[PDB]
């Protein structure tokens, strides 16, 4: 007799460019799994690079089914964050949590609620959901509502040099607990930069970001994703534009944050 | 499939409606005689709420009438429903019978109806009412799709909404399959 | 005990001259370097963090900057090939258009080399396509003093890059040699989830069902350079795609580079 | 700065002409009475060549008069000068005066002219020959810069050449330096 801690199987949902399983990887967590749901071709292929594979990228989220979930083999830990175009209070044009891009959000929820173990089984069950801060008090609260939850506020000024501020809706253990700093985690935006461009501003958030040789420049992609905390050239691939790059980097998860909210997971599961 | 219930063991039904209740006319066929709550704005109904709300057996919401006699984005009924009608599921080790329905008035858009069928898990069974001077349905009641009339068209249906803006008796038979699981009074 | 090299790039690009010279190992003194294009100068200038001095456009360098810039030992370059290109029909020669920036590298070459009597080591190297017009090699050759070597990078890498080569650097003639580490293969340069067509290139890639075309990523990769290389302006694709293009196979530099060691610092 | 030298140690000079040839002209002047290499096309003309064509403390060269007498880019004369007056030139312990002359018969554009003063190192001397009914150059020979004529213009001198196309005397006069530094004959 023994029961073991065994690797993590993982659902993301609206998984972008793989940021869940770069920091599940991060922290030295073994994974059974890591399906995905997206749609985007451009960070599709991202997670297909970066990771060589391992990735099982399902489709469309809403063509995911609960017949789907339970024969895709139980789930451990469920992540996403659906789009925030029409959450934005920025955004003027956005048509809230009930139309446009906005609904995408119940799919999190639908499939949340087919994964999350039922009465009776005990067995360990995590789940994550992150949005834009800035948005309506009402999709707040029905969020909270749908997901039985209140979020956690938590940005990521406070471990890289960017300002996100981004709502967390939850059960991982610790997400209110304080963030750390660590020995690398480039806070300032200068710690970003590439030899022989100077900095501007402490960090991003108030135009072209920083000055060089004399000439003022936007901020250089290698930076940006040193500003997420992505490995440098990680979104090197595909032929895609600077645009579309930026795009991707862009709407990411910040990696410190991600590996700060995952981290208490390597007491639970099979260890690298 | 509901294994079937004899007559001398069904107790009054319970049943929780949402966003319309069908006190009279599930009365009108024997079904009453309270045990169905009502509820309008779902907005803050907690879990627990569901709960306390002593156990369902049927779970009933359906859409605003054409006309737009209150104001919250269609998709909110469907979602809203989903969420209770979880809320009020039995147990694993299924007591007895379970059912829910959910009826739309002809005000969700063909995306709407996409959302709402997957998220319900089956097509709907649209039934009309002809008189030549005068809905769509989700549920698990038995039987409720060999009752489908694949004939009446969209595009006509597309008409008889967008008239209706500028200007009961179908569903009340669904009930009849459930006279064979609860209690009927006189 | 030998010193570090000193050495003067002409038509730099990017930078392969300091990167295969750092490969070796040979401790740089100094790398001044001619560079009139601003994508390839700042990749070199990142790449390498400043060491590189940088010039401007070769014919404004002259005899008083030459010995004033330290004396050289090293002398290396590549001038444009459009002009010298048998396949441009627009091509203006060797005496027009860009083709004339030959004669600079020659000027400079002139300036540079150590004068009769002092015997000091001097080094030096000019490159260019293989397909020019007979005369045009002829005329380099008188002017340079010397015959190329050709050598194609496809003997070392998965490209079919064959140049001519002018220089008194020891061994050119000598076969070149694999290493364990040199992809050859056109498949081990894609990306994961890629194949390959062809074994060299010359839509190179099939992807996931999917005809495509080579990627930066990989193609750094085909030509012998660290991957990533070339990631550095916010730079678009057919810039970045540019730059490596005209750029000189690693492998067929540190090859001709190689018995540099021997004469100077072993950094 | 070329340090004058006494009569009696003034040898003949051995000239080396380059695309014409001074023979006749440098004659005149009392420089010959042979002492002058002439070569025409020295696409083929190697180091060694200009070595074994004993030593030369003259190297001239000029540009093919207006007409294209001959078929090659104007620019091949200038570089092709550069090649061989390097090879001519003498060892490091300079023995004797040591003199270059290259003269272009308005033929050189704006840009080949920028090339060939920056191979020369040294702007050129415009000088001109008026008459009312009817060429630039570039060497060391001294005081050949104070005899500049800063007055042509260069729009009228293009107007000159565009002219001859549709349709000597000048640097004979440029040797006489030279005659403080060689043997004068009759
Ligand atoms: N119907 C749909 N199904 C699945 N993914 C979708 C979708 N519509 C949009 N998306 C995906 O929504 C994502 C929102 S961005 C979320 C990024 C993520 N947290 C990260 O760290 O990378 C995008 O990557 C987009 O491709
Ligand atoms: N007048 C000029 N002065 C300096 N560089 C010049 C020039 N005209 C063209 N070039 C430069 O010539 C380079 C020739 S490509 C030579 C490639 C280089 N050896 C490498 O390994 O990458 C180009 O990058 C171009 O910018």
Redesign the interface.
């Given at each position: 007799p023994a029961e073991k801690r065994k690797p993590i199987r993982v659902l993301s949902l609206f998984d972008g460019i793989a940021t869940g399983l770069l920091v599940l990887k991060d922290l030295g967590i073994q994974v059974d799994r890591y399906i995905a749901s997206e749609v985007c071709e451009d960070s599709i292929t991202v997670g297909?690079?970066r990771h060589?594979?391992k990735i099982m990228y399902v489709g469309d989220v809403?063509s995911v089914?609960?017949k789907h979930i339970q024969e895709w083999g139980p789930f451990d830990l469920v992540i996403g964050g659906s789009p925030c175009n029409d959450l934005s209070i920025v955004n003027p044009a956005r048509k809230?949590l009930?139309?446009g891009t906005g609904?995408l959000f119940?799919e999190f929820y639908?499939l949340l609620?087919d994964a999350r173990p039922?009465?009776?089984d005990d067995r360990p069950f995590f789940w994550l959901f992150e949005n834009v801060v800035a948005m309506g008090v009402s999709d707040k609260?029905?969020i909270s509502?749908?997901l039985?939850s209140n979020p956690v506020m938590i940005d990521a000024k406070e471990v890289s040099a960017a300002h996100r501020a981004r709502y967390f809706w939850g059960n991982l253990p610790g997400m209110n607990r304080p963030l750390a700093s660590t020995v690398n985690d480039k806070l300032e935006l200068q710690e970003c930069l590439?030899?022989?461009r100077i900095a501007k501003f402490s960090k991003v958030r108030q135009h072209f970001p920083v000055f060089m040789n004399e000439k003022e420049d936007?901020l250089?992609?290698?930076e940006m994703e040193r500003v997420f905390g992505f490995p440098?050239?990680y979104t090197?691939?595909?032929?895609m534009?600077?645009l579309a790059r930026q795009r991707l980097l862009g709407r990411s998860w910040s990696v410190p944050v991600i590996r700060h909210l995952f981290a208490p997971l390597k007491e639970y599961f099979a260890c690298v | 499939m509901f294994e079937t219930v004899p007559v001398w063991r069904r107790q009054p039904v319970r049943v929780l409606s949402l966003f319309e209740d069908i006190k009279k006319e599930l009365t009108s066929l024997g079904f009453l005689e309270g045990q169905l709550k009502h509820v309008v704005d779902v907005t803050d109904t907690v879990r627990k709420d569901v709960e306390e709300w002593g156990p369902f057996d049927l779970v009933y919401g359906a859409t605003p009438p054409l006309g737009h006699t209150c104001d919250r984005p269609p998709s909110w009924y469907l979602f809203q429903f989903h969420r209770l009608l979880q809320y009020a599921r039995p147990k694993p080790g299924s007591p007895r019978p379970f059912f829910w329905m959910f009826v739309d008035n002809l005000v969700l858009n063909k995306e709407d109806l996409d959302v709402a069928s997957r998220f319900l898990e089956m097509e709907p069974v649209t039934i009309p009412d002809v008189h030549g001077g005068s809905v769509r349905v989700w549920s698990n009641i038995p039987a409720i799709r060999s009752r489908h009339w694949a004939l009446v068209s969209e595009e006509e249906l597309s008409l008889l909404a967008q008239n209706k803006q500028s200007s009961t008796k179908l569903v009340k038979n669904c009930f009849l399959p459930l006279r064979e699981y609860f209690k009927y009074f006189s």
């Open positions: 297909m690079v060589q594979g809403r089914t609960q809230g009930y139309e609904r119940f639908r609620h039922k009465e009776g609260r029905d509502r749908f039985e590439e030899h022989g936007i250089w992609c290698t440098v050239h090197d691939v595909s032929n534009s600077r | -």
